[PDB]
Amino acid sequence: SKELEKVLESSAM
Amino acid sequence: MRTISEDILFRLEKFGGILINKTNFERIELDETEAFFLYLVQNHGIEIATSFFKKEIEMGKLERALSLNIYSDNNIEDSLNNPYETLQNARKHVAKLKKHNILSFPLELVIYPSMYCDLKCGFCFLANREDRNAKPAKDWERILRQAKDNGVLSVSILGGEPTRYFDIDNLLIACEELKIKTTITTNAQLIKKSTVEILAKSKYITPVLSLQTLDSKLNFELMGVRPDRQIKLAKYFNEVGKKCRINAVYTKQSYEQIIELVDFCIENKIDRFSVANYSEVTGYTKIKKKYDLADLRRLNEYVTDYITQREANLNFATEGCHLFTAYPELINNSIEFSEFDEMYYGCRAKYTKMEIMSNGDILPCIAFLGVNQTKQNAFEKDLLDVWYDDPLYGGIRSFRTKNSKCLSCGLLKICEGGCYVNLIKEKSPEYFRDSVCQL
Numbered sequence: 001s002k003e004l005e006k007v008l009e010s011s012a013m
Numbered sequence: 014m015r016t017i018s019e020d021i022l023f024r025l026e027k028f029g030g031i032l033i034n035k036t037n038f039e040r041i042e043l044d045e046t047e048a049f050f051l052y053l054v055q056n057h058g059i060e061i062a063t064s065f066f067k068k069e070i071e072m073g074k075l076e077r078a079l080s081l082n083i084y085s086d087n088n089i090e091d092s093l094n095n096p097y098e099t100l101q102n103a104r105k106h107v108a109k110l111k112k113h114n115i116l117s118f119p120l121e122l123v124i125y126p127s128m129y130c131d132l133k134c135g136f137c138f139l140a141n142r143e144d145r146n147a148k149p150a151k152d153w154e155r156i157l158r159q160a161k162d163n164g165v166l167s168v169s170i171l172g173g174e175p176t177r178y179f180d181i182d183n184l185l186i187a188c189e190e191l192k193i194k195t196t197i198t199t200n201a202q203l204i205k206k207s208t209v210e211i212l213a214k215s216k217y218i219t220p221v222l223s224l225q226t227l228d229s230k231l232n233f234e235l236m237g238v239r240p241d242r243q244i245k246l247a248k249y250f251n252e253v254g255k256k257c258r259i260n261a262v263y264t265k266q267s268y269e270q271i272i273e274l275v276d277f278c279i280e281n282k283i284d285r286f287s288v289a290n291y292s293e294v295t296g297y298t299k300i301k302k303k304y305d306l307a308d309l310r311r312l313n314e315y316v317t318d319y320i321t322q323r324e325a326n327l328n329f330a331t332e333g334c335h336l337f338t339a340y341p342e343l344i345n346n347s348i349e350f351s352e353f354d355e356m357y358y359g360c361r362a363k364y365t366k367m368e369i370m371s372n373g374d375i376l377p378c379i380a381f382l383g384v385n386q387t388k389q390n391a392f393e394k395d396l397l398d399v400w401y402d403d404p405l406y407g408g409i410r411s412f413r414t415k416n417s418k419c420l421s422c423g424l425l426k427i428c429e430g431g432c433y434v435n436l437i438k439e440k441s442p443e444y445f446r447d448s449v450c451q452l
């Protein structure tokens with residue numbers, strides 16, 4: 001979830 | 014220690030409130046009690062706020078809020094209203110946010126004061142880089158003031174080449190004076206000495222340099238210029254002790270070329286090195302897109318391993334919409350989001366982002382630059398009014414996919430079939446799954 005949160009935070013321009 | 018610090022963002026939300034530290038962007042979700050308390054602090058000061066909620070403090074409800082390092086002394090004048098009316102407006106505001114079911118205001122504002130650019134990058138998402146109707150900084154100041162008052166988190170100055178914008182210096186000074194966490198992204202070719210000086214001494218503004226590679230041959234192919242100017246300016250900011258970042262678009266760099274950039278960022282103490290997904294969403298890009306989001310993850314793995322194995326330190330990041338689709342192992346139906354995260358993660362155009370073109374056009378995203386629908390004017394209408402009633406926002410916010418696979422996807426609520434702008438291009442947007450999705 002910490003890993004998922006980092007990826008989701010980066011999922012943007 | 015009388016009021017909320019300028020380095021902290023506090024906002025009422027439909028679920029209570031949100032707290033964000035502007036130095037690292039870590040969030041804290043608040044209940045109504047905490048939110049209304051801090052709302053009084055914001056408008057009346059700690060003494061009035063604490064007196065009002067004495068019962069709640071007595072019951073231990075506000076222990077966390079009082080303990081947080083978010084307080085300071087400001088020159089801002091308190092509200093002329095009675096604290097009871099302020100609390101009255103708070104309840105009305107929260108109820109309104111519930112009815113509209115939206116975040117209160119965008120966290121990310123992106124302004125394009127001039128679409129003019131001196132370069133013509135083959136990967137540029139803009140259709141044209143000409144502009145003869147750019148507004149003065151004074152007109153943009155009115156925009157920034159609205160953004161600050163309604164709880165924006167950060168402002169990004171783009172274009173176009175913003176350092177070629179005639180009134181850039183005043184615009185930057187305006188951001189500094191309003192204490193808005195700001196970034197400006199530039200090709201660094203003909204940046205003025207006055208502009209560099211303002212940035213070097215700035216507390217609230219961070220420069221980002223657009224640089225694809227140290228390889229002089231390849232960078233010229235991609236940007237039409239050598240890397241010399243970006244390299245030179247990055248060194249300068251280091252020597253004067255100013256934080257500076259670099260952003261590259263992943264077009265056709267090799268791994269060895271990326272690593273060359275990584276090493277450069279390490280030695281010159283770059284504050285952040287980002288590699289962006291090459292986005293075709295606007296439909297104006299020229300260079301062929303070689304790599305996909307799965308390839309972007311592949312690069313992330315390779316670079317992070319290199320940094321670790323070489324025992325180096327660098328704030329490295331890969332960025333792009335729907336990048337999570339390249340992480341299938343992290344996706345499942347047990348994923349549960351908070352009320353805020355569900356509206357924040359995924360497509361930022363829905364509830365967290367606003368972009369304003371040089372002519373005042375308000376877009377939920379730059380992706381709407383290639384959408385043939387009417388856009389409201391920021392120079393003639395309040396941002397907040399548009400944030401509520403705008404049809405483009407309403408369309409992308411209410412869009413729901415009917416795709417079978419997506420309906421069973423764990424990230425359905427934050428994705429809805431992929432990029433909304435891509436989907437509406439297709440014959441049946443609600444059944445089409447965006448091709449960027451690697452799942």
Ligand SMILES: C[S@@+](CC[C@H](N)C(=O)[O-])C[C@H]1O[C@@H](n2cnc3c(N)ncnc32)[C@H](O)[C@@H]1O
Pocket residue numbers: 013136137138139171198221222223260261262287289290291292293298332
């Ligand atoms: C989109 S903004 C913000 C980028 C990134 N989020 C950051 O932290 O700076 C500015 C960058 O967009 C890049 N850019 C231009 N055209 C692009 C495209 N078609 N796809 C992706 N990035 C692009 C420019 O090179 C510029 O460095």
Ligand code: MET
Pocket residue numbers: 130137138139170171172173174175198199200222223
């Ligand atoms: C569309 S790019 C906008 C910012 C600047 N022209 C750069 O490329 O760095």
Ligand code: SF4
Pocket residue numbers: 130131132133134136137138139142172173174200223236
């Ligand atoms: S420098 Fe920025 S605005 Fe100018 S062409 Fe390159 S990417 Fe586009």
Ligand code: SF4
Pocket residue numbers: 338418419420422423424425428429430431446447450451452
């Ligand atoms: S496009 Fe569909 S399947 Fe792919 S991540 Fe989004 S919702 Fe899930």
Ligand code: SF4
Pocket residue numbers: 013294334359360361362363377378379380431432433434435
């Ligand atoms: S509209 Fe498309 S490009 Fe813009 S933020 Fe949402 S997913 Fe990304």
